[PDB]
Amino acid sequence: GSITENTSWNKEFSAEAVNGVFVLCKSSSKSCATNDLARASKEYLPASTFKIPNAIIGLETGVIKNEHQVFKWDGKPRAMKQWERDLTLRGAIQVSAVPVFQQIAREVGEVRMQKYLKKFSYGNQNISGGIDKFWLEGQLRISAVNQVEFLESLYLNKLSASKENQLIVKEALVTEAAPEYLVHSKTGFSGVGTESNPGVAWWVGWVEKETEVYFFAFNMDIDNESKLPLRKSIPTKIMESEGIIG
């Protein structure tokens, strides 16, 4: 494949005073475009975007029984109110109920987790810092480019997991459905960090538009929760401008 830097998208970033990068790749031509080649290769905490490989591994190892698996709430308090209730896989993925996936990771275990991340070529594959924390506040790091490569393998069912489990996770990732296109995506947010070293916000996934497929990965520095919506609005505006969605 190839990648080229462009500038026609910069306006979307400057208008919101955002420091970030968008990587958009066209499947048929194996061609990618980005506003920042440097940042496209910089690696950041996956945060909730890790729910994608975590879900696949959970299914492949049997921790997650099947597509109809219901994650029953133990009634015990949770960081969020929307996390306090029974959830399906898609439900757990969207409200991004950390507790549910922390449990999954713990059951998967360090040896197996390490094994699949190697097979998935997932970022720096560093899971040190707590089996249930590495993707949240640990050592794991991944770039936007690596995100799209990973998502393409998932789309093509080429990851080291059953076709069935990859299919299950892909449908759970459906976020927008239109007659002409289907959007599979996942958000991520590590936190606000500081102004010196801000946290990171993500939005990655792919668009099946007509006979074409567009893989995308977006990330930005964030030191204030009020800016969260930008993780989706900026790349959405870009893809709308490209005539892919909207």
Question: Known binder of ligand: residue 41?
Answer: no
Classify residue 48 as exposed, middle or buried by CB count within 10 Å of its CB (0-12, 13-18, 19+). Answer: buried
Q: Kindly determine how many residues on this chain lie close enough to bind its own copies according to the rule CB under 8 A.
A: 30
Rounded Cα–Cα distance for residues 204 and 22 (Å): 9
d(CA 23, CA 202): 12
Active-site entry in 48, 143, 185, 190: 48
48 is catalytic: yes
Taking alpha carbons only, the member of 233, 18, 39, 2 closest to residue 10 is 18
Say whether 71 sits in a helix, a strand or coil: strand
H runs (alpha helix) in the chain: 10-14, 37-40, 51-61, 89-94, 98-108, 110-119, 134-137, 144-155, 163-172, 230-241
The reply to whether 231 sits in an annotated binding site is: yes
Given the rule CB under 5 A, which residues bind Co ion? 208
Report the distance separating Cα 205 and Cα 152, nearest Å.
Answer: 9
Between 15 and 79, CB nearer to its own copies? 79
* Residues 59-98 interacting with its own copies (rule: CB under 8 A): 67-68, 70, 85-88, 90-91, 94-95
Contact letters for its own copies, residues 143-172 (x by CB under 8 A): -------------xx-----xx--xx-xx-
**Residue 49 beta carbon to its own copies: minimum distance, rounded to whole angstroms:** 17
Residues in binding site: 96, 187, 189, 231
State the residues that interact with its own copies by CB under 8 A.
Answer: 67-68, 70, 85-88, 90-91, 94-95, 156-157, 163-164, 167-168, 170-171, 174-177, 179-180, 182-183, 208, 210-211
Residues in binding site for a beta-lactam: 96, 187, 189, 231
